[PDB]
Amino acid sequence: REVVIVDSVRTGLAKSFRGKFNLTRPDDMAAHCVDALLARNDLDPLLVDDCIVGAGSNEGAQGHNIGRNVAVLSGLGIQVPGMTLNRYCSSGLQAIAIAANQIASGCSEVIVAGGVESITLTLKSVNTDHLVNPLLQREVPGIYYPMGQTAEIVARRYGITREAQDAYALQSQQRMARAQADGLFADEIVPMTTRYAVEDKASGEKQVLDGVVDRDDCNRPDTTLEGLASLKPAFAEDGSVTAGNASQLSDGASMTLLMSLEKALALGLEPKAFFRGFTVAGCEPDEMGIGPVFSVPKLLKAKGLKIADVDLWELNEAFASQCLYCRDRLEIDNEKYNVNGGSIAIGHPFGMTGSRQVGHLVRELHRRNLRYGVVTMCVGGGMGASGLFEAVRL
Amino acid sequence: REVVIVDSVRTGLAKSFRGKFNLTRPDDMAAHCVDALLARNDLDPLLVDDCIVGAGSNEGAQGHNIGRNVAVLSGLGIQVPGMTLNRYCSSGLQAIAIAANQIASGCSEVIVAGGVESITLTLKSVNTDHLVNPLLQREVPGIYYPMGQTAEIVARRYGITREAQDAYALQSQQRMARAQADGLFADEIVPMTTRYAVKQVLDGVVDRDDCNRPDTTLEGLASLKPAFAEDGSVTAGNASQLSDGASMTLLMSLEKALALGLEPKAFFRGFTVAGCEPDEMGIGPVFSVPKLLKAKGLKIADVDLWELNEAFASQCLYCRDRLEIDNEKYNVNGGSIAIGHPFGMTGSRQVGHLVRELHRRNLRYGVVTMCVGGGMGASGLFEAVRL
């Protein structure tokens, strides 16, 4: 049974702590995206069978089964069930794969799926009771290494130079700035009205202000190689990984409307892409960045494709060090790889990224009249996740 | 692409707080179940594609992506990925559904899926930071009602009497006691060695469910005080107990089970969910069950056995009678009123028990279904393999 993406919309990505989502709840952010899918597709909310929300943090602002509460806050209401999942950085893609495979089984027709992260409200809000398994810490200490530490381990282990990382970061900033100037995000970003907190550091003046998030605000079109080369190492005193060649902390949500081809047809909605499969693979936690080099080959083999058959890649730019290792280990064409840049420029709100990448990949396949794209990403804890999508060509 | 349950094993359910799992970590409990699946099926760990763990709490003792950590702790190790999910009470069944649909897609061959709950280590360990959405509490206050309050609302709204609740609770105790005496949980339960607290630490063995009371009487149940309202009908005796435990299920394509020379126990035949009013979450199955039977071309009559979670006698009676299910085919070995409802593991326990009972009674179709905190029903269809 064939399953299509009909639509995918997200918030802008707003800098965490300081930006215009710093008081906005992630449940409300994801519900706003669901409301946009309903309005844009003139969709009867009673037709939606489920609401699947991925998130890295599943507690506090992201506790109490955020996927169900997202459904109830949105126009879907109490009639539409919902669930939450965590495969950290892959969660938004994982949600979409689960939605697609549930529709493929014949037991659902229409699902909204994606993810959210309020890094602002969840990063430093962590239940530490019994959090560490002493036996894991002894057997696989990598399970508890900070992500930036694994980014330095990958740069050193695989010889990814500072210079190569900064050349990659610059490419991401330039490609993102061009795609912004060309309006390539105008259809994927839905504006959201907020209240947000400011403090002047010089006056001590706190205010809550009225705001709108209507674009990604974390990127720096003026970035230069010399600028990146001057930055201090973020994770090791003699290090290569910096704030400039690493993904930024940003807040946001992305949600994806999936249905059977049969149902899209009956509703007179235009399919944008087919879901064509998903894989995950495990690797050493201390080098979690290399995940995709294990998950991508599994996916292409399951689906009868070679690297060369893939027209576009969205491989999450968690760190230039791992993003480059994956590109070069898999021997992917740089001209087909993160063609509008990514998380180095706009940030990585863990839960949402995979759904953002799918929504963007599908629009760019259509814009370039291409066929196959892969969304793939490393995952904290030592995994790769990979999803294959196929543009509907007329 | 046909997907089969090859095996399913679980811990015993031990009383939360005072029982023999009161110092035992939920990751270690689920990892124990994975290790039993590997040993019982002579299974190379490198054939396992994923490890899916459902849990109600996803923080503290159940934080840090418990699904991945269960894989790494187990004989699976770092090569096998894992994930965590929460659809509270249905999580163990939701995990199995995801595994089966993933294998059905052709992108995996072998997955371990199930759930865990340490009520002991998580019930009172809740990050309250920004937990309540004030708009949601205003629009749908039922989203935040205690589960027992929703059980009292179901008894009141649907006229499920104290007397009917108690008679159902006694049935669960008697059916559980008979099945337990006859060894019907022996194959599914994997004994676990523990250290537990009585303030002194003792060596223990969890080798069975310890919450059930075969000596239960109607007269004893009628003497209990209401648990959730001063004028209530729902009691500790006609509600699920607090217990700790884990269940994991081994799924494969039928092709792979045959290549490995393993006996398929049951086909996975589909999974539905449905939304309902949170304040009456207990009735959720009356919405999910019809969607599942309609999707698969079945009627109530086609189903030989039901596992419908005994969260509370009030809702478990309502669902049985609203769906017009024969009590003789319904929770035939009792359930959570007798042994407890460790939220994340229940669905996997129900699957593992149902596939065995279908095989033992030479029956064809069974349904695992449950109400879900937040206002949902989940329903899964299994079909015993003819061999």
TrEMBL record, chain B:
Where the record annotates domain Thiolase N-terminal, the positions are 3-253
Please, one GO biological process term?
fatty acid beta-oxidation
Annotated Thiolase C-terminal domain ranges read: 263-383
Q: Fetch the InterPro entries from UniProt.
A: Thiolase (IPR002155), Thiolase-like (IPR016039), Thiolase-like_sf_Thiolase (IPR050215), Thiolase_acyl_enz_int_AS (IPR020615), Thiolase_AS (IPR020610), Thiolase_C (IPR020617), Thiolase_CS (IPR020613), Thiolase_N (IPR020616)
- GO CC, alphabetical: cytoplasm
Extract one GO molecular function annotation from the record: acetyl-CoA C-acyltransferase activity
Instruction: List the catalysed reactions.
Output: succinyl-CoA + acetyl-CoA = 3-oxoadipyl-CoA + CoA
Q: Which pathway is recorded for this entry?
A: Lipid metabolism
List keywords of the entry alphabetically.
Acyltransferase, Fatty acid metabolism, Lipid metabolism, Peroxisome, Transferase, Transit peptide
Q: What does UniProt list as catalytic? A: C89 (acyl-thioester intermediate), H341 (proton acceptor), C371 (proton acceptor)
Cellular compartments annotated: Peroxisome
Enzyme Commission code:
2.3.1.16
From which domain of life does this come? Answer: Bacteria
Per the record, the major location class is other
Q: What NCBIfam families does the annotation carry?
A: AcCoA-C-Actrans
> Could you say which protein family the record assigns here?
Belongs to the thiolase-like superfamily. Thiolase family.
Q: What is this protein called?
A: acetyl-CoA C-acyltransferase
